[PDB]
Design a protein around this ligand. Structure first.
Ligand code: HEM
Ligand SMILES: C[C@]12C[C@H](O)[C@H]3[C@@H](CCC4=CC(=O)CC[C@@]43C)[C@@H]1CC[C@@H]2C(=O)CO
Ligand SMILES: C[C@]12C[C@H](O)[C@H]3[C@@H](CCC4=CC(=O)CC[C@@]43C)[C@@H]1CC[C@@H]2C(=O)CO
Ligand SMILES: C[C@]12C[C@H](O)[C@H]3[C@@H](CCC4=CC(=O)CC[C@@]43C)[C@@H]1CC[C@@H]2C(=O)CO
Ligand SMILES: C[C@]12C[C@H](O)[C@H]3[C@@H](CCC4=CC(=O)CC[C@@]43C)[C@@H]1CC[C@@H]2C(=O)CO
Length: 391
């Protein structure tokens, strides 16, 4: 449809939530789940709704393919306990100054522009640079790291069938090069450990058990894929919400301590991840519908988040919303282990933007350019005028 309505899937969600919150789509071969309690049930009931998407033996065995997000317990629990040791508040204390520095570097790079793209200049590069730094990627390698990241999330330039195999081949090569890259870093950190996620993971032990090199490679790449574009879209979407609702913008500027809460409302209201994927392990009934083992389930957190039972005045952006029990980071055992990192990246960059440019507004040349996706909700660009030069 239009751009307006690529950035408004919520009307469709409301129709489906108020007619058949659990429904089979025969074309897509999935059960869509639209209502809060259904989405919550699907994500929490891991023994019924599987995350095991490990590729069969006759497909490529990437390290990513058996990484944390694609496995069920007991393996998932063992892996989770180990990688959790790298995402502590202790480690976060070391990450904040790095995030702040990178934020200041990015803002400085475009201080010469009155009109900037939030996406390209700020929210797109921040997560990439942060994750490279805290993983242990040395600064000299960081442009190659960024190029690999760009390829892994690129769209096709044209729809031609051959192009698609091209992009698919470039992504496979980026992944393979990233794997080779991280096996090397792991060797480096095995002899000269550092203050970085890879070093921490090399030393993590939980009941005698340790991560394999492969598992660390696959986790490192997973952090890229799971953490970059999502955090990007949280930051951009937050600016979009504030520019759309100037009263909230003004209020925020007077009550800095509201920013965390305002980000949580963005996580509810313009969720970077709209939906997830599960496979039914056993027959189950949900909203009176009979789901059969092996059938695919798509829970729509984006829709759960508009369910008035849990979010009064769901269509209203409330920077102080309470309660706000959203599932923007998932729910249950697969709950995003980067949620504190994403929250602080968004807080640090947004606070700096709001402090520096309290009069910012849409650029005159703003255009609504949504990411083309049903699972992902965000903007390809977001042109903002700082209003710190004259017109
Ligand atoms: C605002 C930004 C982000 C959002 C909305 C988000 C969203 C999510 C969601 C919805 C899940 C659950 C997926 C599922 O249950 O299958 C998840 C899991 C995960 N996220 Fe995030 N994420 C964000 C940022 C990050 C960052 C910054 C990192 C790390 C750098 C990260 C790493 C992960 C990992 C490793 C998992 C898998 C956990 C597991 O399977 O045990 N994410 N994320
Ligand atoms: C594993 C697959 C590729 C890739 O691995 C996916 C996975 C689905 C879940 C997932 C969430 C991410 O944020 C990283 C990629 C990823 C972990 C996919 C399921 C089918 C696909 C393949 O079988 C290989 O093409
Ligand atoms: C965001 C997810 C990871 C990653 O972001 C995916 C996205 C689906 C669209 C997409 C296409 C790409 O070629 C790069 C990654 C990516 C942009 C996925 C939707 C659910 C998944 C997660 O929720 C991981 O936590
Ligand atoms: C290309 C891969 C399969 C698939 O393409 C992935 C991609 C990584 C990002 C990604 C997230 C999604 O949810 C859609 C698929 C996808 C865009 C993966 C990188 C390694 C994997 C393979 O190399 C399997 O052959
Ligand atoms: C592609 C599917 C839809 C969606 O793309 C899924 C994908 C498997 C990988 C994956 C993990 C997530 O948590 C977000 C979406 C997603 C990347 C699914 C595999 C079968 C399913 C369909 O065939 C629906 O049409």
């Amino acid at each position: 449809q239009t751009k307006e309505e690529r950035f408004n899937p919520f009307s469709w969600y409301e129709e489906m939530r108020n007619t058949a919150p659990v429904q089979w789509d025969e074309e897509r071969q999935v059960w869509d789940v639209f209502h809060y309690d259904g989405v919550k049930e699907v994500l929490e009931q891991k023994n019924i709704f599987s995350s095991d998407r490990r590729p069969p033996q006759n497909q490529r065995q990437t390290a990513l393919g058996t990484s944390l997000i694609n496995i069920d317990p007991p393996k998932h629990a063992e892996m989770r306990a180990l990688v959790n040791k790298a995402f502590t508040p202790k480690a976060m204390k070391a990450w904040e100054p790095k995030i702040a520095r990178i934020t200041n570097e990015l803002l400085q790079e475009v201080e010469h522009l009155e009109d900037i793209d939030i996406v390209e200049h700020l929210s797109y590069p921040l997560p990439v640079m942060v994750i490279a730094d805290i993983l242990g990627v040395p600064i000299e390698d960081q442009r190659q790291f960024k190029d690999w990241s760009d390829i892994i999330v690129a769209g096709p330039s044209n729809n031609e069938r051959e192009t698609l195999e091209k992009l698919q081949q470039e992504k496979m090569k980026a992944n393979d090069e990233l794997e080779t890259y991280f096996y090397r870093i792991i060797e480096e950190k095995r002899t000269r450990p550092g203050d970085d996620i890879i070093s921490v993971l090399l030393q993590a032990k939980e009941e005698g058990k340790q991560l394999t090199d492969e598992e660390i490679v696959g986790f490192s790449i997973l952090l890229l894929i799971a953490g970059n574009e999502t955090t990007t879209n949280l930051i951009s979407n937050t600016i979009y919400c504030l520019m759309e609702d100037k009263a909230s913008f003004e209020r925020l500027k007077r009550e800095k301590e509201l920013l965390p809460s305002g980000i949580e409302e963005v996580l509810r209201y313009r969720s970077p991840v709209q939906a997830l994927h599960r496979i039914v392990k056993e027959d189950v009934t949900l909203a009176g519908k009979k789901l059969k083992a092996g059938e695919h389930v798509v829970p729509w957190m984006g829709s759960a988040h508009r369910d008035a039972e849990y979010f009064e005045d769901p269509e209203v952006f409330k920077i102080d919303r309470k309660p706000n029990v959203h599932m923007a980071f998932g729910r249950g055992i697969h709950f995003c282990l980067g949620a504190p990192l994403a929250r602080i990246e968004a807080k640090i960059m947004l606070a700096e933007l709001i402090d520096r440019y309290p009069q910012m507004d849409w650029s005159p040349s703003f255009e609504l350019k949504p990411i083309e996706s049903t699972f992902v909700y965000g903007l390809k660009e977001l042109l903002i005028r700082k209003n710190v030069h004259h017109h």
